[PDB]
Design an enzyme around this catalytic site. Structure first.
Site, PDB file in Angstrom:
ATOM      1  N   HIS B  71      22.216  92.652  23.396  1.00  0.00           N
ATOM      2  CA  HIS B  71      23.380  91.957  22.832  1.00  0.00           C
ATOM      3  C   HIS B  71      23.009  91.005  21.688  1.00  0.00           C
ATOM      4  O   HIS B  71      23.226  89.794  21.749  1.00  0.00           O
ATOM      5  CB  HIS B  71      24.169  91.244  23.935  1.00  0.00           C
ATOM      6  CG  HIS B  71      24.917  92.180  24.834  1.00  0.00           C
ATOM      7  ND1 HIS B  71      24.533  92.440  26.132  1.00  0.00           N
ATOM      8  CD2 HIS B  71      26.023  92.931  24.611  1.00  0.00           C
ATOM      9  CE1 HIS B  71      25.373  93.307  26.670  1.00  0.00           C
ATOM     10  NE2 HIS B  71      26.286  93.622  25.767  1.00  0.00           N
ATOM     11  N   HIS B  75      23.331  94.926  17.438  1.00  0.00           N
ATOM     12  CA  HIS B  75      24.465  95.494  18.168  1.00  0.00           C
ATOM     13  C   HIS B  75      25.769  95.120  17.457  1.00  0.00           C
ATOM     14  O   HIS B  75      26.659  95.944  17.319  1.00  0.00           O
ATOM     15  CB  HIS B  75      24.448  95.023  19.618  1.00  0.00           C
ATOM     16  CG  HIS B  75      25.715  95.305  20.366  1.00  0.00           C
ATOM     17  ND1 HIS B  75      26.128  96.581  20.683  1.00  0.00           N
ATOM     18  CD2 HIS B  75      26.648  94.469  20.877  1.00  0.00           C
ATOM     19  CE1 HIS B  75      27.265  96.518  21.355  1.00  0.00           C
ATOM     20  NE2 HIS B  75      27.599  95.246  21.488  1.00  0.00           N
ATOM     21  N   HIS B 109      32.092  89.944  18.225  1.00  0.00           N
ATOM     22  CA  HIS B 109      32.542  90.237  19.600  1.00  0.00           C
ATOM     23  C   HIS B 109      31.561  89.907  20.731  1.00  0.00           C
ATOM     24  O   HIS B 109      31.982  89.819  21.888  1.00  0.00           O
ATOM     25  CB  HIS B 109      32.998  91.699  19.728  1.00  0.00           C
ATOM     26  CG  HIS B 109      31.885  92.639  20.051  1.00  0.00           C
ATOM     27  ND1 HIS B 109      30.999  93.096  19.100  1.00  0.00           N
ATOM     28  CD2 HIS B 109      31.491  93.179  21.226  1.00  0.00           C
ATOM     29  CE1 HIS B 109      30.106  93.878  19.676  1.00  0.00           C
ATOM     30  NE2 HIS B 109      30.384  93.950  20.963  1.00  0.00           N
ATOM     31  N   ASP B 110      30.270  89.772  20.422  1.00  0.00           N
ATOM     32  CA  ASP B 110      29.284  89.345  21.430  1.00  0.00           C
ATOM     33  C   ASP B 110      28.546  88.054  21.031  1.00  0.00           C
ATOM     34  O   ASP B 110      27.436  87.799  21.498  1.00  0.00           O
ATOM     35  CB  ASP B 110      28.263  90.448  21.722  1.00  0.00           C
ATOM     36  CG  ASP B 110      28.729  91.429  22.795  1.00  0.00           C
ATOM     37  OD1 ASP B 110      29.432  91.055  23.757  1.00  0.00           O
ATOM     38  OD2 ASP B 110      28.351  92.595  22.696  1.00  0.00           O
ATOM     39  N   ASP B 220      32.299  99.435  20.823  1.00  0.00           N
ATOM     40  CA  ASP B 220      31.340  98.714  21.638  1.00  0.00           C
ATOM     41  C   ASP B 220      30.317  99.662  22.283  1.00  0.00           C
ATOM     42  O   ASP B 220      29.131  99.372  22.316  1.00  0.00           O
ATOM     43  CB  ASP B 220      32.078  97.914  22.714  1.00  0.00           C
ATOM     44  CG  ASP B 220      31.261  96.769  23.243  1.00  0.00           C
ATOM     45  OD1 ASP B 220      30.167  96.483  22.707  1.00  0.00           O
ATOM     46  OD2 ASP B 220      31.720  96.159  24.226  1.00  0.00           O
ATOM     47  N   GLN B 272      22.941 107.199  33.762  1.00  0.00           N
ATOM     48  CA  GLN B 272      23.528 107.497  32.456  1.00  0.00           C
ATOM     49  C   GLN B 272      24.569 108.614  32.559  1.00  0.00           C
ATOM     50  O   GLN B 272      25.663 108.491  32.026  1.00  0.00           O
ATOM     51  CB  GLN B 272      22.435 107.862  31.442  1.00  0.00           C
ATOM     52  CG  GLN B 272      21.634 106.662  30.951  1.00  0.00           C
ATOM     53  CD  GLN B 272      22.493 105.668  30.188  1.00  0.00           C
ATOM     54  OE1 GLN B 272      22.788 105.860  29.001  1.00  0.00           O
ATOM     55  NE2 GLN B 272      22.911 104.602  30.870  1.00  0.00           N
TER      56      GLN B 272
HETATM   57  C1  LIG Z   1      24.817 102.517  33.677  1.00  0.00           C
HETATM   58  O1  LIG Z   1      24.712 102.656  32.256  1.00  0.00           O
HETATM   59  C2  LIG Z   1      25.568 101.771  31.628  1.00  0.00           C
HETATM   60  C3  LIG Z   1      26.397 100.871  32.177  1.00  0.00           C
HETATM   61  N1  LIG Z   1      27.217 100.035  31.455  1.00  0.00           N
HETATM   62  C4  LIG Z   1      28.114  99.078  31.979  1.00  0.00           C
HETATM   63  C5  LIG Z   1      28.298  97.901  31.279  1.00  0.00           C
HETATM   64  C6  LIG Z   1      29.201  96.953  31.704  1.00  0.00           C
HETATM   65  C7  LIG Z   1      29.939  97.189  32.844  1.00  0.00           C
HETATM   66  N2  LIG Z   1      30.890  96.245  33.254  1.00  0.00           N
HETATM   67  C8  LIG Z   1      31.012  94.970  32.777  1.00  0.00           C
HETATM   68  C9  LIG Z   1      32.110  94.431  33.407  1.00  0.00           C
HETATM   69  C10 LIG Z   1      32.599  95.461  34.250  1.00  0.00           C
HETATM   70  N3  LIG Z   1      31.852  96.567  34.146  1.00  0.00           N
HETATM   71  C11 LIG Z   1      29.761  98.347  33.574  1.00  0.00           C
HETATM   72  C12 LIG Z   1      28.851  99.277  33.124  1.00  0.00           C
HETATM   73  F1  LIG Z   1      28.695 100.409  33.812  1.00  0.00           F
HETATM   74  N4  LIG Z   1      27.283 100.052  30.101  1.00  0.00           N
HETATM   75  C13 LIG Z   1      26.522 100.870  29.457  1.00  0.00           C
HETATM   76  C14 LIG Z   1      26.619 100.930  28.022  1.00  0.00           C
HETATM   77  C15 LIG Z   1      26.430 102.008  27.184  1.00  0.00           C
HETATM   78  C16 LIG Z   1      26.697 101.522  25.883  1.00  0.00           C
HETATM   79  N5  LIG Z   1      27.051 100.231  25.909  1.00  0.00           N
HETATM   80  N6  LIG Z   1      26.993  99.887  27.209  1.00  0.00           N
HETATM   81  C17 LIG Z   1      27.137  98.539  27.583  1.00  0.00           C
HETATM   82  C18 LIG Z   1      28.378  97.944  27.514  1.00  0.00           C
HETATM   83  C19 LIG Z   1      28.518  96.616  27.867  1.00  0.00           C
HETATM   84  C20 LIG Z   1      27.419  95.896  28.291  1.00  0.00           C
HETATM   85  C21 LIG Z   1      26.176  96.492  28.363  1.00  0.00           C
HETATM   86  C22 LIG Z   1      26.036  97.820  28.000  1.00  0.00           C
HETATM   87  C23 LIG Z   1      25.579 101.805  30.161  1.00  0.00           C
HETATM   88  O2  LIG Z   1      24.865 102.559  29.513  1.00  0.00           O
HETATM   89 MG   LIG Z   2      30.543  91.961  25.266  1.00  0.00          MG
HETATM   90 ZN   LIG Z   3      29.199  94.513  22.785  1.00  0.00          ZN
END
Ligand SMILES: COc1cn(-c2ccc(-n3cccn3)cc2F)nc(-c2ccnn2-c2ccccc2)c1=O
Ligand SMILES: [Mg+2]
Ligand SMILES: [Zn+2]
Ligand SMILES: COc1cn(-c2ccc(-n3cccn3)cc2F)nc(-c2ccnn2-c2ccccc2)c1=O
Ligand SMILES: [Mg+2]
Ligand SMILES: [Zn+2]
Lengths: 315, 315
Positions: B71, B75, B109-110, B220, B272
């Site tokens: 972050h 990004h 946004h972050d 995002d 993933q």
């Molecule tokens: C398991 O693999 C992943 C899981 N999450 C993920 C992330 C967040 C949440 N969350 C937050 C609140 C509720 N739920 C759930 C999630 F599942 N995000 C990504 C990802 C792929 C590209 N940006 N991005 C990402 C998006 C946001 C934050 C970090 C990574 C990822 O690859």
């Molecule tokens: Mg964010």
């Molecule tokens: Zn972001």
């Protein structure tokens, strides 16, 4: 929509992958109708149906699946794909008519499903249970198939002789009925006996009908043969329906069985373990013995069983 | 530093590449601020912001991204670039105020992200969670954005009418809040229903807000839409953050979830695939339905999904 479907071409990457048992259609929703056309063409030939009629039929079938968590259009196409892979891997064991019948039967096998079990409809005196006392939903699914076939320009079996038209509807009827899991247990027992005694004979029509039945079960359950993350997400959809049925029962002052009771989520991993041991593994084991090229289905099912065992032990 | 930015000209060899959805800013770190200026200029026009205020603003935004594994400033620019490509490919649909607001929102946004989830901050009673009970970090990101605008020589919106100013700030506020992935699931479900029932109407501001929210999610998450080597490497940055958070929890004697647990490293490819099926695929699917020119994002997402499958299968 059916007009656009007529110009559809499967992307080349998918042409390789679609032949494999483990193929997951999930990521390709816009392509599902075209995927079915592709499969029918590869298995049955490009002039098997008149394209316009086939495309109209497919689109009407899609329209007649409801937006329920599991028994929806996605499920229909997933089951048809598993059948495609079984047929492609055992091609000359089945006649042209059987391959046509079975692919169509798989696409249509859950038509107009409302997310309720035969047990529910029978116990709570639904009008379908009055019409169909046994295999309630499955008779309705076959009813819906015929009803779609008889729509304007939807009759994909129009060029058949009457004799062959009758044969294929009967293939379809038996195949759809066999998806009533209540019938599976006896079917599999008979087939395991026949295989052990070395008496199974595919030229014997009653033996043949039984093999087809088992193929239908194997296809119907194939979400348990996908990669672990896919299988797990599908389980969420299956239980969403089970619990929603259980919730309806609770409103009518009746305790649901544990698998339909959303207050019993803890038992789901063990519920899944129990289902694989009692239903899924036996199904694919018997299938593999009868049709050896289907072994990857058993291997994949075994892999997922292992995953549930891990969940139980604490992961 | 902001002075040297004012002189920047994007190298011509990048003028076509930059318009592609799958463009990777990775190899061009020293250009990132200039790349944002370029995108603002082509999308909003060289008139809409005083160059000096814009340049100071960008530099202060950059400095308010921390040195965290994922972050971070890279990004921010990656997300802004995806938004640029969406806006450029749908140029009739969005107003001047929306295009301005949305590029700014993506860059900001972050802001001041600390590498911790909302769940973590709430669980461990961080001051930010005491302040903002829901969408904790996202409310912080917006607050940081307003703080930066209110610095001397930083108000890039100073020439807008009083009405335009409060509108654009609301656009930015809603866009940044929408990047809380907790909120995406309901947003996308609502949109799918609106599209399916034909009730989606972009004259309706509430409908516009929902579509913008989905675009924000799409941008995002856009690392899952790059070429495989880029996507794979970015996944490492993401898990580095997840695992440092999980590690912080262990230090406190508290057990992290599977996604946060570096002991579950071997399960990354499965995680993933799960994430793509549960989140990314539906996101780009619904976006493509509403905005057909965004289709290349879905196509790229599908390609990476198959690559993760191949990793799982050991191909
Ligand atoms: C398991 O693999 C992943 C899981 N999450 C993920 C992330 C967040 C949440 N969350 C937050 C609140 C509720 N739920 C759930 C999630 F599942 N995000 C990504 C990802 C792929 C590209 N940006 N991005 C990402 C998006 C946001 C934050 C970090 C990574 C990822 O690859
Ligand atoms: Mg964010
Ligand atoms: Zn972001
Ligand atoms: C406990 O977990 C499960 C239980 N049943 C299940 C289902 C039905 C019946 N039934 C009894 C009499 C008639 N029908 C019994 C069952 F045990 N089915 C699945 C399952 C896995 C994949 N498809 N599929 C499925 C199959 C059919 C319907 C829903 C789900 C499952 O995962
Ligand atoms: Mg059924
Ligand atoms: Zn079924």
């Amino acid at each position: 929509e059916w007009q656009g479907l007529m110009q559809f071409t499967l992307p080349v990457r998918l042409c390789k992958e679609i032949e494999l048992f483990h193929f997951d259609i999930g990521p390709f929703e816009n392509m599902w109708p075209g995927i079915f056309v592709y499969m029918v063409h590869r298995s049955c030939g490009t002039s098997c149906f008149e394209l316009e009629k086939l495309c109209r039929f497919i689109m009407s079938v899609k329209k007649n699946y409801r937006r329920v968590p599991y028994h929806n259009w996605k499920h229909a196409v997933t089951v048809a794909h598993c059948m495609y892979a079984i047929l492609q891997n055992n091609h000359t064991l089945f006649t042209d008519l059987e391959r046509k019948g079975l692919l169509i039967a798989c696409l249509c096998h859950d038509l107009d499903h409302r997310g309720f079990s035969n047990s529910y409809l029978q116990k709570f005196d639904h009008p379908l249970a009055a019409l169909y006392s046994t295999s309630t939903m499955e008779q309705h699914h076959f009813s819906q198939t015929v009803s779609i076939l008889q729509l304007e320009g939807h009759n994909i079996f129009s060029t058949l002789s009457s004799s062959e038209y009758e044969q294929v509807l009967e293939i379809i009827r038996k195949a759809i009925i066999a998806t009533d899991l209540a019938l599976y247990f006896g079917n599999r027992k008979q087939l395991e006996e026949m295989y052990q005694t070395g008496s199974l004979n595919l030229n014997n029509q009653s033996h043949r009908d039984r093999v087809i039945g088992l193929m239908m079960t194997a296809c119907d359950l194939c979400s348990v043969t996908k990669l672990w993350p896919v299988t797990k997400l599908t389980a969420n959809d299956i239980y969403a329906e089970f619990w929603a049925e259980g919730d309806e029962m609770k409103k009518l002052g009746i305790q649901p069985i544990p698998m339909m009771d959303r207050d019993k989520k803890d038992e789901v991993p063990q519920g899944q373990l129990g289902f694989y041991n009692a239903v899924a593994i036996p199904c694919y084991t018997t299938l593999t013995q009868i049709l050896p090229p289907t072994e990857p289905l058993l291997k994949a099912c075994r892999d997922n069983l292992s995953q549930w065992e891990k969940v139980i032990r604490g992961e």
